[PDB]
Each structure stands twice: as C-alpha cells, then as structure tokens.
Amino acid sequence: AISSKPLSVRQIKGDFLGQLITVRGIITRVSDVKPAVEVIAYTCDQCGYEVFQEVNSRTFTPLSECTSEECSQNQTKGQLFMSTRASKFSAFQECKIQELSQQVPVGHIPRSLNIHVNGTLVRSLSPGDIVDVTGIFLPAPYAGLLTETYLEAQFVRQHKDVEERVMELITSGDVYNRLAKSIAPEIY
C-alpha cells in the first residue's frame, strides 16, 4: 500500500530508500531541462567501428583506446572520439519539493527534497504547483557514510464551449450589475 500513501517530506525516513513512495508538497524551484547521457557513442578514427559506453552514475570517465576487436585483434591502438549524434541522451531535470504549511510541526523549518525527473515526464512540474509525486526514493554518494538522497519521479498528480457558453450570461441578463456585485461577493 505504500505507493498509495501521501507522505510529507519529513515522514520520508531512511527506511524508505529504494521503495516506490508518493510525496505531497509544493515545488519550490525547478531546473531548466538538461541532456543526461544514457549511452555515450564513440567513433573510432582508425577502424570506423563505433563503440558504446552506458553510464549509470553522476560522473563517468571517457574512453580513449579502441576496445573493439577490429582494432584490438590487430593490436591497433586507435583513438575513440565522442559523438553527440550517435549518443543516446535522455531529458533530465532537477526539481525541489517542500512540505506544505500544514505538514510542518510546531516550530520546525519546512524540510525539502530533491526530485529527479527523466524522459517524457520532464517539465510536468512547475514552481508553485502543489502536487503528489510518486517516485523511487534513492541515495546518491557524495561526509563518509552520510548520503545525499533524492526522489526519482515516476508519476505526478496535480492538486489544481466558451464562445457559446458566454451566451448563457448574455441571455441571463443584468450583466453589469451582477458581474459588478460578483467582485468579492461577500464584501458589502
């Protein structure tokens, strides 16, 4: 049932790492979209046979010597050069969610959490959105054994014809008086 429950950010204890959880909060800021690499593609100058590196981490090391047997079986130390066109990038965006004013206990600071959103789900979050976000709560190593931690977003639930429907009010009538009274209707 845990993916159903809308936790506040401070209720996301360390026991929930690795689990698919849903968090309720307000998006306080959002990054511009940036290309993360999934698979780097390298052209090889001295044999033409490309090679690939899948990246699973915040950082990677670029390849240099051609590992392909087209080079290596000829013991030819050919050079690898990265190509953007043949590399698979994925759309990446970092957001930060903050717990709502009702969730903050008495006298505490409103705690907040990084959200990482990838793929088609990108730019589903705007700042000021009050939202339930399902994601995998995960660690990232940077401190020593203390961890950076974030929410890998998976699903978003937002909390919040006319050219003929306007004729409803036109025919209803007394439009100026009623529309004027409808500005702040409770105000005498």
Binding site: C47, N74, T76, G78
Partner: protein
C-alpha cells in the same frame, strides 16, 4: 602445481597473413579492376589513382602501420621469406606458362 603467471602477447605483419586471401590474392583480384591510368589525367592524379587502392588494401589487411611503414615491412619481408618468394615466382611462372 603452477597457478598462472602473466606474459604480453603481440602481433605483427607476417608472410602467412600476407599470403592469406585478403593479402596478395586480394591484389590479384582487385588491382586491375580498381586502378586505372589514363593520358586524360595529369601525373599527380594518376599516381593517386594507383596509391588509393594500395593504401586502402594495406589498411584493411593490416591497420596497425602507416602506409610508408607498411611498404617498408613489405619490402623487407619480401626480401626475407621463402614461401613468399615461391608464391611470387609462381605468379611469373604462371605467366610464363600462358
């Protein structure tokens, strides 16, 4: 008994590899098809028309070495292998048998 101890393997151009199908038989199959020399073109172009085939063939045969280094190794191994000498004289022996 002996658990493994390492050593460095190595590879170089060699007469057997040079006598494989992608070696000189490739030249005999493709050179007369791909090189063409003509009075209609300048000397520089005609020399390039020779060189392009041999450079691509040399790379595809043995991509380690530069073209000039490849030519030097070809000259020296040609100078110093009996099987390659037998094959080379066999070409002209065949032409003599025509």
């Amino acid at each position: 008994a002996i658990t493994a101890r390492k050593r460095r393997p190595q590879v170089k151009l060699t007469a057997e590899k040079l006598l494989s199908d992608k070696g000189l038989p490739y030249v005999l199959k493709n050179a007369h098809k791909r090189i063409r020399i003509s009075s209609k073109k300048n000397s520089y172009d005609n020399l390039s028309n020779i060189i392009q085939f041999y450079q691509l063939w040399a790379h595809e045969l043995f991509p380690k070495a530069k073209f000039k280094d490849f030519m030097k190794i070809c000259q020296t191994v040609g100078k110093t292998d009996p099987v390659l000498r037998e094959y080379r004289v066999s070409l002209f022996r065949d032409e003599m048998g025509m």
